[PDB]
Design a protein around this nucleic acid. Structure first.
Ligand SMILES: Nc1ncnc2c1ncn2[C@@H]1O[C@H](COP(=O)(O)OP(=O)(O)O)[C@@H](O)[C@H]1O
Lengths: 41, 49, 520, 86
RNA sequence: CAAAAUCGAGAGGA
DNA sequence: CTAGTTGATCTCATATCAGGAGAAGGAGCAGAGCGAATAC
DNA sequence: GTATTCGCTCTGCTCCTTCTCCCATCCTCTCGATATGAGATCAACTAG
């Protein structure tokens, strides 16, 4: 449930900020979502 | 706590699906069905064990 | 001489001996030959079919009808038990035919392959057993045969048996099957049969299951829903329509008056376990092995076989006058002793059947304990001696009782000489019981016969009886009518291990019929 | 939380059945002999006998049949054994 | 006269 | 020579994410050069 | 009749995607999981 911006040096994305979301009650597994920024109109 | 609840959640889901199967076959045959035969208790017992 | 549609002439004297139903059957069979399709003779056991086939073949050869001029090299697959009967009937009715046996007994005394070749080049009627076909399938299936008559072909009900695949190799379209019971366990037997005679008619096997086996079978259960019952009824009507032309099934109910048979009785006896036998049964059903089986751990064969043995007799634990298999230790044997006494005092000839060879041996020992004149036959007896023994027993009335294993005792043998029949031990396949009890009430039976089927009440035998009752219900649901009442005496589950001892159409008819089909 | 989160399974041919679960219980750990007599089992006996030190979980189910015409009846089978928890 | 299985997991030692 | 018995064998039948690196194959583009082919 | 193109071919360059192999040695221990018989043939008897 917290947003983490990482970057993989050998990669096609300049960045990627994931959020391994999960409803606090153990209702379903965590559903991750990424919000990236394509590498280097 | 969290690990064992991960197991219980999965195994309870499987109990519920199996009870659906059992209830469904006997209801399809037009007959009622007993819970105590629907609930294959060994699922949770042997899964956790 | 009887004249058929196109050119089929049978000699008049030969036609005369035939009854009405048999000549009707001959006409039907030649019509089948005209279409170039196979067929099944559904006439019940003993209505007389070898006569029908012999008459048709003799007429065809006599008619010189048009590869083959008239009759080509045929083959008759028959069980070993009736082979010399077949030869005798061919010689009696049509002695012109050359009938040569392919058997170890045989009449050749040389290489068999030479015999098959000679019969093929001689337009002879080669008779053989299923075993040679299974073994010699290479050699048999190369000679451009004409007919492949299967006597008691119901052996082929196993679709994937080696014999089945072996006999399904002959390329001729004229395939004949002789069996009064061409379905014994379930619809798959019917499927394999119509696979052999007419490969296309019913669809491929899985299609056949989905299309008829499920809607038909599942609709007969006690718990069947009314809509499902109507569905099964519809499908059964459709299937009977489909297969109608290729089964000719006359009962011994519409021909009895035109055939002058004596009366028959179907009394079923519900035996009581003896104290020792009851104790053994109670002990075994309380054992751990049955508990393991009910838990699915072990194969169900062993427990069922043990229960059958117990009910037949406490031979598991061989307990003077206490020798192995002593008659007073099994209630069925006491009742049998009583009936044998009564019938011997009544001067009647009895027929004694059993499923298992060992109980047949115990019964033989008990008969030796009595003074009754017996005469026994099982798979052990040499085949060459079997038909002579049948002739003997049908000849002299001195022999009081006749011992048989049902797997050879039934199956096309004529035992009109006997008067009384007792079925000691039931089986899973009711067709076995029907064939056994029909060994007596046949053409030529000059005395009233009565059937006595023995079941130990409240035991495994009662449950097997229920199962085979359900089986006759399934079969009659399609062979006799589609309005069969649902089986209700048992739910047929795996609680038979328990002991419960007592005490041109004008486009309007077509539309209307089709609507009727759709409103079920 | 898991039990009351699990959705009720409405199955029907017609008669329909949801099989609702609402409450749990845990009895103290117990052992049943071959005869089946429930007795209290201490950890030392479990270790010496190679058993499992566990407690039986009970849920009080509530099944309602709804076929037609408001033919509703709440069937509740109190203390329905589900499993054993270590 | 030689009697005593295999496959996975884990913890260790130098 | 020649019928009867004994064993072995075989068939059928019974219910119910925090690898990587290097080779191989095909892909798409790019231009060179030569057959004919228009055309001055 | 030779420029002149030109289309077609024929390499052949990059460039990407696919696929396939490899990961120190030796040693000790524990623990959990992973039928039954009827019948027919045939061959050797087993005697006549
Ligand atoms: N018209 C007939 N004339 C003489 N014998 C007949 C006649 N019809 C039937 N039989 C005899 O009835 C007996 C049973 O017939 P068969 O075909 O051998 O058994 P199944 O009817 O079960 O097929 C046979 O012995 C047959 O010779």
């Amino acid at each position: 449930n917290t947003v983490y911006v990482f970057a993989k040096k050998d990669s096609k994305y300049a960045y990627t900020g994931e959020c391994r979301s999960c409803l606090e009650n153990s209702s379903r597994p965590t559903s991750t979502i990424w919000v990236s920024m394509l590498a280097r109109a | 706590g969290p690990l064992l609840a991960f197991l219980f959640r999965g195994m309870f889901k499987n109990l519920l699906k199996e009870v659906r199967i059992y209830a469904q076959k006997f209801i399809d045959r037009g007959k009622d069905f007993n819970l105590e035969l629907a609930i294959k208790t060994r699922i949770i017992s042997d899964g956790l064990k | 001489d009887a004249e058929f549609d196109e050119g089929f002439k049978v000699p008049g004297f030969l036609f005369k001996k035939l009854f009405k139903y048999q000549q009707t059957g001959v006409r039907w069979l030649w019509e089948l030959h005209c279409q170039q399709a196979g067929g099944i003779l559904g006439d019940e056991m003993g209505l007389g079919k070898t006569i029908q086939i012999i008459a048709f073949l003799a007429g065809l050869s006599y008619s010189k009808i048009r590869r083959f001029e008239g009759l080509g090299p045929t083959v008759i697959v028959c069980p070993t038990t009736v082979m010399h009967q077949w030869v005798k009937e061919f010689h009696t009715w049509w002695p012109p035919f050359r009938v040569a046996i392919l058997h170890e007994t045989g009449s050749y005394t040389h290489k068999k392959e030479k015999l098959i070749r000679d019969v093929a080049h001689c337009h002879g009627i080669l008779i053989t057993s299923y075993s040679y076909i299974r073994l010699m399938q290479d050699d048999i299936s190369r000679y451009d045969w004409h007919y492949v008559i299967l006597d008691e072909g119901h052996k082929i009900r196993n679709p994937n048996a080696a014999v089945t695949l072996a006999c399904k190799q002959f390329r001729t379209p004229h395939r004949i099957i002789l069996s009064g019971s061409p379905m014994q366990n379930n619809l798959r037997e019917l499927w394999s049969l119509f696979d052999f005679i007419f490969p296309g008619k019913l669809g491929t096997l899985p299609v056949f299951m989905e299309q008829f086996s499920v809607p038909i079978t599942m609709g007969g259960y006690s718990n069947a829903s009314p809509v499902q019952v109507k569905t099964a009824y519809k499908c059964a009507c459709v299937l009977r329509d489909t297969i109608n032309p290729y089964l000719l099934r006359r009962m011994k109910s519409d021909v009895k008056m035109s055939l002058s048979l004596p009366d028959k009785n179907e009394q079923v006896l519900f035996c009581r376990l003896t104290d020792e036998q009851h104790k053994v049964y109670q002990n075994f059903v309380d054992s751990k092995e049955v508990y393991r089986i009910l838990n699915g751990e072990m194969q169900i064969f062993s427990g069922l076989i043990a229960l059958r043995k117990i009910c037949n007799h406490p031979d598991l634990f061989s307990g003077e006058e206490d020798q192995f298999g002593y008659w007073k230790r099994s209630g069925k044997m006491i009742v049998v002793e009583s009936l044998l006494k009564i019938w011997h005092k009544q001067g009647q000839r009895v027929l004694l059947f059993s499923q298992s060879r060992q109980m047949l041996d115990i019964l033989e020992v008990f008969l030796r304990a009595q003074k009754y004149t017996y005469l026994k036959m099982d798979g052990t007896t040499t085949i060459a001696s079997r038909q002579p023994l049948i002739t003997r027993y049908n000849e002299d009335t001195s022999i009081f009782v006749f011992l048989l294993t049902t797997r050879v005792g039934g199956l096309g043998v004529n035992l009109t000489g006997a008067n009384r029949v007792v079925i000691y031990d039931p089986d899973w396949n009711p067709s076995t019981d029907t064939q056994a009890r029909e060994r007596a009430w046949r053409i030529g039976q000059k005395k009233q016969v009565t059937v006595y089927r023995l079941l130990t009440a409240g035991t495994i035998e009662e449950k097997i009886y229920h199962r085979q009752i359900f089986k006759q219900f399934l079969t009659n649901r399609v062979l006799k009518d589609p309005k069969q009442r649902r089986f209700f005496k048992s739910n047929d589950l795996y609680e038979l291990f328990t002991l419960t001892s007592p005490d041109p159409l004008a486009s309007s008819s077509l539309l209307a019929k089709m609507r009727a089909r759709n409103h079920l | 939380r898991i039990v009351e989160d699990a959705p009720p399974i409405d199955l029907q041919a017609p008669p329909r059945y949801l099989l609702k679960f609402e409450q749990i219980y845990l009895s103290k750990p117990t052992h049943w002999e071959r005869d089946g007599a429930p007795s209290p089992m201490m950890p030392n006996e479990a270790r010496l006998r190679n058993l499992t030190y566990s407690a039986p979980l009970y849920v009080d189910i509530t099944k309602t049949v709804i076929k037609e015409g408001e033919e509703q009846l709440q069937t509740q089978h109190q203390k329905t054994f589900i499993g054993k928890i270590p």
